[PDB]
């Protein structure tokens, strides 16, 4: 079973404003 | 030796000179040639 998989220098959600899914808000 | 309380003990001869060197040589000599009829060696503590 093997995974490796790429895309990992971190993530963005850049600032001056913040992250996605909402935190709290239907 | 404890420098803080060294004088404190030599005061009471708890530590320091023996009972043959902290008395005036006159008494040390006299009491030496008397411990046959008037013992004096037991009253003059000797520290250890």
């Amino acid at each position: 079973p093997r995974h490796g998989s790429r895309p990992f220098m971190g993530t963005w959600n850049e600032i001056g404003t913040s992250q996605l899914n909402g935190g709290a808000f239907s | 030796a404890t420098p803080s309380m060294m004088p404190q003990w030599s005061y009471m001869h708890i530590a320091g000179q023996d009972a043959s060197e902290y008395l005036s040589p006159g008494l040390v000599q006299f009491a030496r040639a008397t411990d046959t009829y008037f013992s004096l060696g037991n009253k003059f503590r000797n520290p250890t």
């Binding site: - | 803080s4 004088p7 404190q8």
Partner: protein, 178 residues
């Protein structure tokens, strides 16, 4: 008030390296009320010599500071442990082993295959030196018996206020919950 005062001994906490409490010499003191002014004039003076000895051995052994019992000794006045570089004699030639094991059949139950061998001198002391709290062999070096040549003679402020055991020098307050 008084002057040949009777040194204030320093207590220890084998816990946090900093010291703890302080109090006049609770026990070790003569009883001269059975004495007249021929040795009450010498006890007074033997105690003065004790005070002078304490002063000299304080100014000669201590490391000049600004707070009697510092709340956290800096990382440069606390006796640090400087061990010696540990030297392990790496007991084999890795290249030689791997090579022969791949070759021939050596399963290999100094060395005979190759006369190569090298030490691996490491570092031994630490990464970040210790900071807070001194050991016993430093307590009896830093907090020499403290002689208080005058009693609490001043405003609340100026007063060795590192003596009261229930002092929190961090917040200059007496702790509670007792």
């Amino acid at each position: 008030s008084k002057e040949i005062p009777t040194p204030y001994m320093w207590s220890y906490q084998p816990q946090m390296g900093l010291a703890a409490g302080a109090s006049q010499d609770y026990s070790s003191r003569m009883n001269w009320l059975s004495a007249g002014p021929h040795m009450i004039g010498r006890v007074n003076g033997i105690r003065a010599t004790r005070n002078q000895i304490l002063l000299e051995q304080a100014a000669l052994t201590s490391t000049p500071r600004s707070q009697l019992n510092p709340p956290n000794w800096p990382a440069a006045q606390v006796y640090q442990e400087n061990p010696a570089p540990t030297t392990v004699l790496l007991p084999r030639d890795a290249e030689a082993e791997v090579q022969m094991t791949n070759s021939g059949a050596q399963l290999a139950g100094r060395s005979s295959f190759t006369p190569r061998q090298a030490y691996l001198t490491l570092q031994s002391s630490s990464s970040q030196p210790r900071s807070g709290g001194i050991g016993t062999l430093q307590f009896v070096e830093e907090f020499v018996p403290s002689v208080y040549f005058n009693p609490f003679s001043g405003a609340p402020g100026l007063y060795p206020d590192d003596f009261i055991p229930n002092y929190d020098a961090v917040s200059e307050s007496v702790d509670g919950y007792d």
